[PDB]
Amino acid sequence: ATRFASVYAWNRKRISNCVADYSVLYNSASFSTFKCYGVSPTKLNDLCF
C-alpha cells in the first residue's frame, strides 16, 4: 500500500468473491513477524470462508 493509516485509524479492506493465495509471500520469509495465533499459517487457507 502506498499509504498506511495510523494504528488508531487502521485501514480496513474487505475481501470477497475471490481466491485467497498467499504462499508466494509466506515462503519468502520477507516479514519480520508472521504470528498466526491459534491457527496454522498455511492450512487456514484450505477452506471456503
Partner: nanobody, 122 residues
C-alpha cells in the same frame, strides 16, 4: 427450520463427571460455532463454552468453568458435546445449547434449544 434438542441431563455429585449433548438439525453449521450456556436458577444465563466447526477449531470457556466443562462438537452429525468434569455444588444450573455465527470475533448465538437441568448437590 432449525431445531436444537438436548439430552443427558440429571444430577451429579460434587467431583463426579457428566456429559450433556445437544444435536442440531435442519441446516448445516460448519460456518457456525457450537456452544453451551448455563442458567443457575434465579440468575442470568451465563456462558459455558463454545467450539467452532473448522479445521482449526477455536474453543472458548466461561471463567467459573474454564478447563472443567470441556466442549467438543461434530460436523457430520451437527451436534455439540459438553463433558462436565469434577463438579461442585455451584455448578447447578439449566444448560442450554446455542448455535451461532462468529461476528466481530465474538460468538453470536442465533438458534437456541429448550435446555436441560444439570444439578450438583451434596
Amino acid at each position: 427450520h432449525v431445531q436444537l434438542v438436548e439430552s443427558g441431563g440429571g444430577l451429579v455429585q460434587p467431583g463426579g463427571s457428566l456429559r450433556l449433548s445437544c444435536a442440531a438439525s435442519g441446516r448445516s453449521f460448519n460456518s457456525y460455532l457450537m456452544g453451551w450456556f448455563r442458567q443457575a436458577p434465579g440468575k442470568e444465563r451465563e456462558f459455558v463454552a463454545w467450539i467452532s466447526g473448522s479445521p482449526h477449531d477455536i474453543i472458548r470457556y466461561r471463567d467459573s468453568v474454564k478447563d472443567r466443562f470441556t466442549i467438543s462438537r461434530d460436523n457430520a452429525k451437527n451436534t455439540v458435546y459438553l463433558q462436565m468434569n469434577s463438579l461442585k455444588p455451584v455448578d447447578t444450573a439449566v444448560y442450554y445449547c446455542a448455535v451461532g455465527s462468529l461476528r466481530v470475533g465474538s460468538f453470536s448465538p442465533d438458534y437456541w434449544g429448550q435446555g436441560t437441568q444439570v444439578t450438583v448437590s451434596s
